[PDB]
Amino acid sequence: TEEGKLVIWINGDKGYNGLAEVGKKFEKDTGIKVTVEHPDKLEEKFPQVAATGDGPDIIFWAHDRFGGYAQSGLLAEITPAAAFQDKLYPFTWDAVRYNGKLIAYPIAVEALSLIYNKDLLPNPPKTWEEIPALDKELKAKGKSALMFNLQEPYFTWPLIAADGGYAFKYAAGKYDIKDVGVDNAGAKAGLTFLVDLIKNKHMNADTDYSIAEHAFNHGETAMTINGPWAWSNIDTSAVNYGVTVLPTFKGQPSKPFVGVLSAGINAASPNKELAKEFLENYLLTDEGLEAVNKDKPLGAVALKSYEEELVKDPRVAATMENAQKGEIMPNIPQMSAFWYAVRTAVINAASGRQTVDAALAAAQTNAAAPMRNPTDSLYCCDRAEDHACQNACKRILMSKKTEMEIVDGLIEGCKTQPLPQDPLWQCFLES
Ligand SMILES: OC[C@H]1O[C@H](O[C@H]2[C@H](O)[C@@H](O)[C@@H](O)O[C@@H]2CO)[C@H](O)[C@@H](O)[C@@H]1O
Ligand SMILES: [Cl-]
Ligand SMILES: [Zn+2]
Ligand SMILES: [Zn+2]
Known part of the structure; x- marks a missing residue:
């Protein structure tokens, strides 16, 4: 990533050209350029390239895979205001809530x-x-x-x-x-x-x-x-x-397993404020969602102003009838x-x-099959007193290690005081 630029990933079957048109409008208003890409097997590529700090600022997929990304520490917590949350249907927000935190912006409801x-x-x-x-x-x-x-x-x-x-x-x-x-x-x-x-x-x-x-x-x-x-x-x-x-x-x-197309913010992105700007004020508008929809249809959008009118088209009504007969997909790892x-x-x-x-x-x-996973204690890295230690912790817990190797890596990169008095180590011990 690069500060002052936005890079976005979204699937090849979605309205990437339409999303790019929204990007052109964001650049004309604000001077920030937006590059839209649709790489193959993007849902598996994102967790790989985020381990190398080579991910997009913004990643689109159905909400089911986002809990896994959030667990692994690949997603920033998003901070929409109460006023903005009210513009979208409550249940679409529910699909992007993970351990109590909003981890992505809901876009549209998908049903077969x-x-x-x-x-x-x-x-x-x-x-x-x-x-x-x-x-x-x-x-x-x-x-x-x-x-x-x-x-x-x-x-x-x-x-x-x-x-x-x-x-x-x-x-x-x-x-x-x-x-x-x-x-x-x-x-x-x-x-x-x-x-x-x-x-x-x-x-x-x-x-x-x-x-x-x-x-x-x-x-x-x-x-x-x-x-x-x-x-x-x-x-x-x-x-x-x-x-x-x-x-x-x-x-x-x-x-059908119902999907909520969602837009997540890379935890490693330096443009989290620009990503919020683009998503809240440009994409999640009537004119933005229409630009994407015009290209490939989104379905039942999460924005109420648009969905109230869009649901008039019988195919959207059918999508909702099918979705009501099925279940929202889990977001669990x-x-x-x-x-x-x-x-x-x-x-x-x-x-x-x-x-x-x-x-x-x-x-x-x-x-x-249960997995070995240390990423469940990532929240303790946030109690580090130094910046260098918080990042060192995030990489250690992220990176496939045994418990011995996690303890030893944290000692090397993250011992600033005695362990029993350090809030990061107190958190880790309890977890
Ligand atoms: O195929 C299993 C697959 O299902 C979903 O992928 C959907 C996606 O929801 C749709 O937006 C569209 O792109 O078609 C996909 C089907 O190939 C899940 O969201 C996905 O995680 C899962 O692997
Ligand atoms: Cl590619
Ligand atoms: Zn043919
Ligand atoms: Zn053909």
Whole structure:
């Protein structure tokens, strides 16, 4: 990073050009230039490059991965005023709260919807169970019924969760990380149905985002499953399409994992005041969010002034109907392991290299696997009396060490007085 400049990272499927237009407006008003980038596998790249002090000032992703970043000390605590908080819907703030602190700015609510081709299929199906017969009928006309991304577990999760599949058990405002629900009856029923669609040649196992998107946008498949960002390319196409409630499975709603696109501030960034300026007064405005939305649609934005009007479009109404039927994703550190384990299971089951039961049993263990993590005592680095020690502490606790190595590193870089009288060491001992 560089003082007086902002660098922002955001996913390739989002409105990066539109975000850049907001950046041009920020530079014209204030003289601070904004560079928008969309690197590949940005959600894994950010925690890597923040360990090297080579991260952006601002990072965009769905809120589920932010708790992990915050745990690891990669995010500054943001400081919106009461007046500003009131401009956004309370629940979007709830998605960015981690151990009591606001760790990112909420942007927009994301939910998966069923997208169908009104000409090939004027009445979309209300249940998953009727889709196989629909494909047989459409195959007679050289088409298919449904194609969606089988490589990302986000797209398959609504079916997995419909009859009972869950990520982490939620008991009184707390997620139990030892209780993973990806191997219960409901999860197996859902994944088995997908696998049976593949075996019965109503779907193929290699379908991914580009393939499904191409099939739907060129009138070859009657349906896909995707989020607001995908409407842009469909609008550009000649397809007459609708966006509606996901089909039910075993009489239950499909439960998508709902994402809140969020903008976090790099803890290592020297531009935290400029990042706050840009996010609060330029991006989180009607004119800013419209600039991004115009490019790729955001969905149900967190800003009330804009959302009150935007929700008039039926596709946004559909996103909200789908989101209300599902659950806000957890923001806990364990979400990254949960996602990776379900990704393996679905691919391995869909390809037939494992059985549903074998794939999902492995996922339960891996999603529950506890990690060694010292980053839980990062807050003690803030009680250091010197600046040099606070930073030395942050790097020691961040950097993969054993406990012996953390204790020894802190002694080397952070002993200024006797240990029993030092507030940083008193904090560390208790923690
Ligand atoms: O695929 C698992 C994946 O799900 C989500 O990623 C979503 C993201 O929420 C959407 O904004 C859009 O970019 O599509 C993605 C699906 O590939 C989670 O947020 C993510 O952490 C997770 O790995
Ligand atoms: Cl890249
Ligand atoms: Zn194409
Ligand atoms: Zn084609």
